[PDB]
Amino acid sequence: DDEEETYRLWKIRKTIMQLCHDRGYLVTQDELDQTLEEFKAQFGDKPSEGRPRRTDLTVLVAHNDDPTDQMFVFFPEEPKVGIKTIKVYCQRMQEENITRALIVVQQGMTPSAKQSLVDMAPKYILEQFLQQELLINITEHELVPEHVVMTKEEVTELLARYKLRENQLPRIQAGDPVARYFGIKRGQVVKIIRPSETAGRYITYRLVQ
DNA sequence: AGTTGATCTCATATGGAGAAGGAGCAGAGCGAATG
């Protein structure tokens, strides 16, 4: 029971570190490859005993390109997170001056909390993940090809090369599992590199909608 | 400027699949009123 919850927490942490590394936040190799017994050593083996508390699991990371661009990962203790908890995180983000955070929720989020993530979105970007959808890194699955988020300059070069408008690219939904993983917003473009049985390799581009 | 006549026209008699709307209803959370 605690042997199950500690395994879940470890897997979720591993996936979150992989996600942060793929978003380009500075993540050490040691924490990226931390084993289950090392997790038990650092945080504990009886989360029902409060060892760890899920408040202990919180992560803070900084971007490789700018040490002031920082992101939290929060693991709320309550199963169904309400607006009180979002307000607590908003306060903590305001005082630490952190604009991005991921909120990992065990069972869900209340309608009011969902709307509160929308209504603060320009200044503080809060994202919801279920813990279930973090128990496996979907980008390691064999059906999912390599996704690379493009820079604005690279999109301008793309559109200038093929002489096309953004609306002529094929789309990806902002709610797509992989778009959510990379955290890409409307109007960004993701380069996709996939093998092909007739050319050898093929690149395609999707505009987020 | 005045006169004729066809002709029209009224009126008389006796399977299934997906999508969309509504009601039920649970329950979040806001604000007033305590106690």
A109: the nucleotide nearest its CA (via C1') is B28
| C-alpha span between A32 and A108 (Å, rounded) | 27
Q: Which positions of strand B lie within 7 Å of protein CB atoms?
A: 28-30
Quickly give A205 CA vs B23 C1' distance in Å.
45
Contact residues for strand B with beta carbon within 7 Å: A 80, 82-84, 110-113
Give the separation between CA A192 and CA A209, rounded to whole angstroms: 16
- Residue A137's CB is within 10 A of a number of other CB atoms, namely 16
Of A5, A122, A137, the C-alpha closest to A75 is A5
Burial class (CB in 10 A: 0-12, 13-18, 19+), A29: exposed
The full set of domain ranges for chain A reads 1-136, 137-209
End-to-end CA distance of chain A: 42
- CATH level 2 (architecture), domain A137-209: Alpha-Beta Complex (3.90)
> Burial level of A201, CB count in 10 A (0-12/13-18/19+)?
exposed
Technique behind this structure?
cryo-EM
CA distance A124 to A17: 21
Indicate the pairing of strand A80-81 with strand A108-109: parallel
Å: A139 CA to B26 C1': 37
What span, in angstroms and rounded, lies between the C-alpha atoms of A137 and A173? 19
- Resolution to one decimal, Å: 1.9
Nucleotide nearest to A81 (CA to C1'): B28
Quote the CA–CA distance of A29 and A177 in Å, as a whole number.
Answer: 25
Q: What is the CATH number of domain A1-136?
A: 3.40.1340.10
Q: Which nucleotide is nearest to A111 (CA to C1')?
A: B28
Strands A171-172 and A200-208: parallel
Sign of CA dihedral A152, A133, A97, A67: negative
Give the integer Cα–Cα distance in Å for A87 and A9. Answer: 24
